[PDB]
Symmetry: C3
C-alpha cells in the first residue's frame, strides 16, 4: 500500500487556497459533530465547499462532506473544518488526514481537534468536557496508521514520537480559561481511545476499554493528531461526553445517535465560548 497523495498534490491544494483567499490562518480547528455552530463566531468569514477544493476527499453527494471556513476568531486567524472524515465511512487514513497537511502548508502552526465521545470514566457525566492528555490508538497497533507507507522527510521523520502529542502548555492555560467561565462542573482531563466503529461497543468491549485506562471512546481524531505531530503542529483538543457507555447487563438503555446529537445541542453555546476564549491563550507566531 501507499498514500495516494504526492507531495505535489498537497502543495497544489495549498496554493489553490492561498490563491483564493486573502486570509492566512495560524490556527486550524476541527469541529467534532458536537460543535459545527462555531462558524457563526468567526468574522470576515469565507467559506469553501470541500467539493470545490482540489484533491479533497469526496462524499458521494458532494456537499455532505462539508466546508472549509476561514476567518478571525477572537483575534486569531483561523481555518475551520465543518464536517470531517472517519475511517468507518470507508476512507483510508491518508484521506482522513489529508487536510491536516494542507493546513501546515498553509502556514498553520497549531491544531485544535474536538469530538463527541462516550464516557468510560465512571465519574464523568453527559455534558462534561474532557481535555485530551493522551490517546490509545487501537487501529494504529494493527497497521491502520496515516503515516503507513513511504515517508516524505519534507513533512516529518520516519518514526515520530507521540508521547508529547498534547501540548502541556495549552492544557494548563485551558484549566485557567475554565475558572474564568465560572462553571459548576469541573473541567475533566484524560485519555481518549480511538476505535473504528461504526457500530457501538458492547458491555464487554467497554470493560476492555476501561481496563486499558481510557476515559473516553470515539471514532476519530487520533489520526489527525498523529499527522499534525508528524509535521510539527502544536496540538490541543478535547471531547464532549455525550453519553456514558453502557457498562453492565441489567441496564435496559442503549447508546444511540439521536441522544449524541441531542447532547451536542446542550453543550453547543458552552463549547463555542470555550474555544473562542481559548484562542487568546494560543501563542502568537514568531
Amino acid at each position: 500500500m501507499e498514500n495516494g497523495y504526492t507531495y505535489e498534490d498537497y502543495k497544489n491544494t495549498a496554493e489553490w487556497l492561498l490563491s483564493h483567499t486573502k486570509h492566512r490562518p495560524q490556527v486550524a480547528i476541527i469541529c467534532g459533530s458536537g460543535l459545527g455552530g462555531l462558524t457563526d463566531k468567526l468574522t470576515q468569514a469565507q467559506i469553501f465547499d470541500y467539493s470545490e477544493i482540489p484533491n479533497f476527499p469526496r462524499s458521494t453527494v458532494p456537499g455532505h462532506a462539508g466546508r472549509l471556513v476561514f476567518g478571525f476568531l477572537n483575534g486569531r486567524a483561523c481555518v475551520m473544518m465543518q464536517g470531517r472524515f472517519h475511517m468507518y465511512e470507508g476512507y483510508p487514513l491518508w484521506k482522513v488526514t489529508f487536510p491536516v497537511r494542507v493546513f501546515h502548508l498553509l502556514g498553520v502552526d497549531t491544531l485544535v481537534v474536538t469530538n463527541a465521545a462516550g464516557g468510560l470514566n465512571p465519574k464523568f457525566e453527559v455534558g462534561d468536557i474532557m481535555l485530551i492528555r493522551d490517546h490509545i490508538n487501537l487501529p494504529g497497533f494493527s497497521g491502520q496508521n496515516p503515516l503507513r507507507g513511504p515517508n516524505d522527510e519534507r513533512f516529518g521523520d520516519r518514526f515520530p514520537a507521540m508521547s508529547d502529542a498534547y501540548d502541556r502548555t495549552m492544557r494548563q492555560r485551558a484549566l485557567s480559561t475554565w475558572k474564568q467561565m465560572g462553571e459548576q462542573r469541573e473541567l475533566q482531563e484524560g485519555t481518549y481511545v480511538m476505535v473504528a466503529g461504526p457500530s457501538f461497543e458492547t458491555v464487554a468491549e467497554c470493560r476492555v476499554l476501561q481496563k486499558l485506562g481510557a476515559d473516553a471512546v470515539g471514532m476519530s481524531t487520533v489520526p489527525e493528531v498523529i499527522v499534525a505531530r508528524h509535521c510539527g503542529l502544536r496540538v490541543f483538543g478535547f471531547s464532549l461526553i455525550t453519553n456514558k457507555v453502557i457498562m453492565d447487563y441489567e441496564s435496559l438503555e442503549k447508546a444511540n445517535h439521536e441522544e449524541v446529537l441531542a447532547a451536542g445541542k446542550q453543550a453547543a453555546q458552552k463549547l463555542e465560548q470555550f474555544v473562542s476564549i481559548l484562542m487568546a491563550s494560543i501563542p502568537l507566531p514568531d
Copy 2:
C-alpha cells in the same frame, strides 16, 4: 473502501431464492464447523449449492463453499448454512456476512449462530457448550467491521448498538431446554472473543484474552452478529468448547485442527437435539 454489494444485489439473490423454493424461513441457522450434521434433522429438506446462487461468495473449488438447506426443524421454517466464510480465508467481511442480509430479505427474523471455540475460562471443559451473552470484536476495533463504508438505511442505521446483541429471552429459555435434556455438565455462559487467525494463539496471547474477560475464542460469528443486529434480526448463539487453550509454558500439548474436529464428533448428536429442541422456544412471527 466500500462494500462490493449494492442493495439491488442482495434483493436479486433473495428473489432468486424466493423463486426457486416454496419454503419461507423465519429462522436462519449458521452451523459452526462442529455441527454440520444438523441438516439430517430437517424435513422437506431442499438444498442449494452456494455455487448456484447469484452473488454468493465463491470458493476456488466451488462445492467446498457449501450449501443452503431450507426445511422444517421441529415445526420451524429454517434455512441453514452448511459451510460458512471466515476472514482468515481472504474474504472481506462484506462477503463473509452477505448471506445474513439475504436471509433478512427472505423474511427471516431470527439468527442462530454456532461455532467451535477454544476455552479461555479455566473452569470450562472439552464438550461444554457455552451460550453467548456478549462478544469482544477485536478486529472491529481496528477497522475490520462488516458495516464499514456507506450505510444503506434500507438495512439499518449508521451507528447501531451492540450492547443488546444476544437476546436475553432466548438465553433464559435456553437454560430451560437444558434441564429438559437432564445433563451432567451444566450449560455454560459467557463472552466470545473474535480473533482473525488462522494460526492459533500463543500462551501470552491467551493470557491477554483471558484478561480482557473473554471466555471463549474463535475466528467467526461476530461479524454475522453485527450485520444481523444492524438489520433487526433477533440473535442467539453458542459455542462448542473443543479444546482448552494452552495457558502455561511447561505444557507439552498444542492446539490442533484434528482434535477440534474430533471434539465436534463427540458433541455432534448432543448439539442437534439441543438446537432442534430450542426451535420451539423461538417466538412465532406476527
Copy 3:
C-alpha cells in the same frame, strides 16, 4: 484478498539462488537494524542485492532494500538478510515474509531473528539483550497475518500452532553461551509484542502493552516467526533493548531513531560474538 505469490514463484526464486551459489545454508539469520555488522564475520561470503533476485520485495531506490549474504559462520552454513521489510513501509505481510519461505525451499531448517526493541519491563536497561520466549501478535488479532488467504499444504497446515514458536532447547543453550561470555548484565528473557508503527507509542499505549504482559515492543519479526513455524523451521531469536519506553507524563524525554541507532552501535560487537558463538549450539542437520 490473497497472497500475490504462487508456489511456483517461491520455487523459482529458490532455484535461481540454488543456481547462483554453491552454498547450501542450514541457518537463516535476519539481522535487526541493530546488527547488520554480522556479515563481516562470515567466511566465503557471497552477496546478492535483493534487487537482482527474482520476486523479492522491491524498495523504490532498489539498493536500499539490502542484500542476501551466504557464507559460513562458526562452521554453520548461513544465509543472512541485511535489510528487512516492515509493514509500516507499506508492505503486505505476504511480502514481508516472502524470504522465509524462499529459505525453507533452499533447505534451511532453522531461523534466527533479531531486532531492536523498546523496553517495557521496568527492570530492563539500554544494552540489554532479551531472548524471545513468546510474542503477542496484535496486528494478527485484527486480520494482519501473513497466512491470511488460501493455504498451500505444501508449506504447512490451515491452522498452525504458535504456543511452541520459540525453541525451548535453543533458549537453554543460549543461557549457557552467555556465562561463557562472562557478562556483567544478565541475559534477559520475555515476551515481544509486535505493533505496526511507524510512530512511537504514547505513555498510555505503553501502559497498555505493559499490562498485556509484554516485555519488549517492536514493529517486526512476529510475521516471519509465524511463517517459519508454519513451514517447520526451528525458530530462535532475541531483541536488543535500545531504549526504555516513556512511562509517565512528567518525563521530558522522547523515543527517537537517532538514539536507537546509537544503542545499536554500543551492543554491535557484543551481539556478533553472541550470535556467532550460538551457531555452534545449533544441531547439525540429519
